């Protein structure tokens, strides 16, 4: 009884989503990744200098 | 040369490295045991016969040996997890009942759990000592109301060493893996002889291992 | 709390022997390294000796080697120093100082209460001018010049600063000339290139009047400079 | 023209023994699972076997191919002596291991408390000095022939240990029999190991040492194969690295990891 | 009743999720040029430990890291000089998690003893000491992270998340919507919400200020073992024992990528992201971690270590290095 009431009360809040399109989220993800793909040292290895590890 | 303070830092690092190595070599001489049981087992008897909401660690000395016994009874999670934390353990100890066979059955579930823990992936090269608790208790129970059991096709004699031997042989079974011995013993929980058999089992395990190095085994 | 107590001073005939002992009770003495600092009767400061935490490394000064010996007794939390064949120029007042060396440390942070003993190449630093007329509530800056560049290849500059109140033991202000030690107001600031170093004091008030000292820790032996004192004109 | 094949074979030997020694040294280190106080002993067994060849075999190639020792009186004494020291030690260690196991297998509870690296290093230094003290005194380069000597070291060099190992091994067999009265498959496995271990060390030297001892005051006329015996004394050397390690899988596993 | 109402609500929310968008992430990003193969080599060898290790964390400034071992010792490693800053001995040998605060003042560590305690690193006495022992849970601890200088969030086997407070030393909140054993949590870069997994193949997002969950994603098969965000905090990609790595978006509220490979059938112990959100590292069993492209979902160069067996891995704030720790007591820094 009480457990079912709490479960349905939580489900009501769970369904309270707007929600934006999946394509919009994917576009935002690609845009952010492309914009920030300039400072990471994984894709572009650092030169011999400026590298703390020998 | 590199610097002034870095030399002192390196010296401190070597000093604490030596301290850590000394502590580790000191702590590597002791032997650790894992006690695992089931519902209404002889946990109290084993704990009291040694001489908060968590795991209990008991360390005791007997003939130049510091036994560190760990029992996990307060845990409520699934035993499939956190079991790998005890992979490097010398031996484990199991208690069964005897005379729990018609109550919420008991021996069937205990045997199933023993078989399950004896046949898991990473916990194989570990010896299992198994105790036959309540030795004096089941005699009257088997005498008054034989036999039976709900476990069928027993088709053997009645009382009473025969049943104990059959149960011991059945529990000794299911050891599919080789080079792994299971020890059995029966205690009335009256006298003080469990420590001696535990010591004998431990020294046998140690001998089987060293002997192992030459291998040779 | 942390507190260093020593008592070994007295009148000693020239060419005599004496023992100095300082005790630590406020911290773990076994995990720290000890320093000895000499203070000339008028103004000067001079380094004496160092012993590491593990007592496996020992250093001495040019005018100290071959005459004085240092030791510490870890279970008793005590530091011992031996004055042997002391000369007239050795009359001075002494400090024993705690120091720990690891990444992001604050060595020479705490200094003990001194005792006075009476009788009867190397990096140099310069300070000027020893007399500066200043008034409260007005910014002041003090600079000291060093001979060799302190900028190591690791990106660090081993320079320390100290303040000595009139009549009290000195205390540390800045370590590595770029950080700020605990218990120091944010008004203090110090910066410089690899050779020149200068403080930046803002809103000066009527208690920061002690003499300033700048010290180098690049390599042994440690050398101190002639400090500059302020006034209340 | 046989000299070309003879030097080629000798170099092949030397390469095999140095490769085995360096492989064992690499495997024993940089392995947390393999690391153990008893393993450093094997390192010492390699610690000489790594260089003994490079300090003994080529000089043996210098001799007994053209008939004369190229160098003068020096250094024919330090070589020989140096031989006896490097060589004697191996036969010397190869004992201490067996002696340890038996000490480890018998009353393991008491002995396990004494297993410390300090011990092991003390045992290593003690065996090195006892080998040196029997080697260095005294004081056309051939092997010494003073009667007051060979009959001496020959005993203290070999028979000091063949009795030990042999004994240590029968004793162990005695104990692999009491303890196991599948199992049937390993019954022919462990006896085969033990037999191989006790046989490799004996089949090679023993004939040498027995011919070397036989040329004392009461002597005979050995054939020239005796030179045959001499190398045998070495080929055993190249062997230990394998014979001891391929029967302890941690070592295997380490070999598989390093070689793949 | 009203169980039928619950199941029809599940059906209608599933239909709404299906009809939310037509995106599949397969027809798109295919024409985008993928990154080349990535090669890494071992640059450091931290061999100061003596037994199994479980978890490790990276401190701020990407130079100091903390690791925990079954030997009951915490070592404050130095990434560059490979020296040990501190050696903290613990009361309980068994340890399952250790976390480093944003400021080096405090470090948290815990295990099976139902307590993850706090240790102070900056004191006048110049030695590590017990700061506070916090005992509120009953099940085994999984991981407690630092949300502030004096506020931590815990995860215990009793299916609760509490968000303890240091000075008061008592629970100020509780979360009980999992109905299953939790395994990991990772606070978002924003300090107002986080997410945590569970043993029932479900991941739930919790609000720091409020007391109830919001989404409760259930788009997984078997289990959950590691969760970690990437900047902008919208993926928290997770892995499990089913050899599957999946990422979920809070706004999308539906499965997006569900990485999978047929050759490997193994488990997952830890997952971490890069600084730019392009490469994600996941440590598998089989003893060799892997790197996956976030967008193209292809496979890059396999990694060498470790002997036995990879268990944790972390990425620094600047991304200049990655630390990996395995049961063989070896910590390796890879660049
Ligand atoms: N290569 C060994 C050499 O034959 C040797 C070693 C020890 C001895 O006692 C000896 O006479 C000769």
Numbering used by the authors:
A (entry chain G): 9 to 62
B (entry chain A): 4 to 54, 182 to 234, 242 to 354
C (entry chain H): 1 to 120, 124 to 236
D (entry chain R): 46 to 184, 202 to 243, 379 to 457
E (entry chain B): 6 to 340
The authors write:
The α2A adrenergic receptor (α2AAR) is a G protein (heterotrimeric guanine nucleotide–binding protein)–coupled receptor that mediates important physiological functions in response to the endogenous neurotransmitters norepinephrine and epinephrine, as well as numerous chemically distinct drugs. All three α2 subtypes are traditionally known to couple primarily to the Gi/o protein family and inhibit the activity of adenylyl cyclase, resulting in a decrease in intracellular cyclic adenosine monophosphate (cAMP) levels. Despite the chemical diversity of the agonists, the α2AAR-GoA complexes bound to Norepi or the imidazoline agonists have very similar overall structures, and all four drugs occupy a similar pose in the orthosteric pocket.
First, the amino-ethanol group of Norepi interacts with D1283.32 and Y4317.43 (superscript indicates Ballesteros-Weinstein numbering) via a salt bridge and a hydrogen bond. Second, the para- and meta-phenolic hydroxyls of the Norepi phenyl ring form hydrogen bonds with S2155.42 and Y4096.55, respectively, which is in accordance with the recent docking pose. Recent functional studies showed that the F7.39N mutation completely abolishes the activity of Norepi, and the Y6.55N mutation can substantially reduce the EC50 of Norepi for α2AAR. Although I 45.52 makes weaker hydrophobic contacts with the phenyl ring of norepinephrine than F45.52, it may result in different conformational dynamics along the entrance pathway in α2AAR, contributing to the higher affinity of Norepi. The outward movement of TM6 (12.6 Å) and inward movement of TM7, which are hallmarks of GPCR activation, also occur upon α2AAR activation. The antagonist RS79948 binds at a further outside position than Norepi and extends to an exosite to form interactions with the extracellular loops.
